[PDB]
Design a protein around this ligand. Structure first.
Ligand SMILES: Cc1cn(C2CCN(Cc3cncc(Oc4cccc(Cl)c4)c3)CC2)c(=O)[nH]c1=O
Ligand SMILES: Cc1cn(C2CCN(Cc3cncc(Oc4cccc(Cl)c4)c3)CC2)c(=O)[nH]c1=O
Ligand SMILES: [Cl-]
Ligand SMILES: [Cl-]
Ligand SMILES: [Cl-]
Ligand SMILES: [Cl-]
Lengths: 190, 184
């Protein structure tokens, strides 16, 4: 079973990953985790990071260019993902394909039913063959928390919620920070 | 020996690659060739071409974004390239790193000593580890404005010895004499 944890930076994804991993293991499930982007391993991820810090000329200003780098990062990890899924009861990803849809649409001032989101779905799932998550869990935060570029983050949190409402790429759950971890594990892996 | 053939689109590189291969093989050397971008083989290459036909939103409008995709295409081929060099007497590339420098600088209205050219050299040769060609052969021949500036940037690159030794040839170059000149 493949689960993706999603949300804006500072939402608290890492803590939720840990709480859920513990809840799963307490129920007898084995768990492996993997975080995107794979900063430090993926050349495409590290070029993207450098672009975010002002390197590589005009690279970061293209929305689709940055999205492509993150997709190439995941494509490089497809064998790892499949290996974990065969070897473990539950694989939890800290960010997956939906992160690309949310930030790309937000940067373009689009919504979840717009072009950017559909482009991501086509290129990452259909073309690159990345495995679809069984669950996408949105750790949803307020506009005030998201902004703390501030506007870009706020628009990303709104797209995320739209993606969850539309069932983009599969089933979603929407949770808050202080989620009941044993209840969530029972819901995700029934 | 690694040789890269360079020039503006339509210069006739493909014909020159063919003739040069024959001259080498007629001289007793084994030869392999490889063309960049690796359209149809590279995900990064095919996205770049699609972007050139108006696809992938704003991607094609970023000069460095397009350059990065072409660099990532080559990075995907670095071992392929090294394998051919170990396996064959002569490896001829139809376009290589200098193409990225020439089109990128030209699109930025920069020259060969400007930022883009130094950036290509840095990310492709030093960081991604692409092997420096033994020879870069510029086929200099007789939007159009972009193509014109690219051919001049190309000549500047050859004049400065960018990335290694260059030869500048015209349309009627003698392929057998050029092979003899390149030959070790
Ligand atoms: C895994 C993943 C991650 N991301 C984001 C995740 C958040 N970071 C950090 C960030 C967080 N909040 C605002 C930011 O400003 C910019 C500025 C320029 C480009 C982008 Cl994509 C974002 C940047 C950027 C990549 C994607 O866009 N796509 C992905 O697929
Ligand atoms: C192998 C390679 C190739 N090229 C070019 C070669 C020429 N083609 C075709 C072309 C020829 N002449 C003008 C063009 O206009 C554009 C339009 C958009 C982007 C770019 Cl880079 C060029 C396009 C584009 C990629 C690079 O820029 N870098 C490379 O590394
Ligand atoms: Cl977070
Ligand atoms: Cl475990
Ligand atoms: Cl708020
Ligand atoms: Cl040509």
């Amino acid at each position: 079973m493949l689960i993706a944890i999603e949300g804006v930076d500072g939402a608290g994804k890492r803590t939720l990953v840990e709480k859920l991993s513990g809840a799963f293991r307490a129920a007898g499930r084995s768990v492996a985790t993997l975080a995107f982007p794979r900063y430090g391993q993926s050349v495409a991820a590290d070029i993207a990071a450098e672009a975010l810090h002002g390197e590589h000329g005009d690279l970061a200003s293209s929305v689709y260019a940055m999205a492509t780098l993150f997709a190439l990062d995941r494509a490089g990890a497809v064998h790892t993902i499949q290996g974990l899924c065969r070897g473990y009861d539950v694989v939890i990803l800290d960010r997956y394909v939906a992160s690309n849809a949310a930030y790309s649409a937000a940067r373009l001032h689009e919504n979840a039913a717009g072009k950017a989101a559909a482009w991501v779905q086509r290129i990452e799932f259909a073309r690159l063959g990345l495995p679809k998550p069984d669950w996408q869990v949105l750790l949803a935060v307020s506009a005030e928390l998201a902004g703390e570029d501030a506007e870009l983050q706020q628009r990303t949190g709104a797209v995320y919620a739209e993606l969850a409402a539309q069932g983009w790429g599969g089933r979603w759950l929407v949770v808050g920070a202080d989620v009941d971890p044993g209840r969530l594990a029972a819901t995700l892996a029934p």
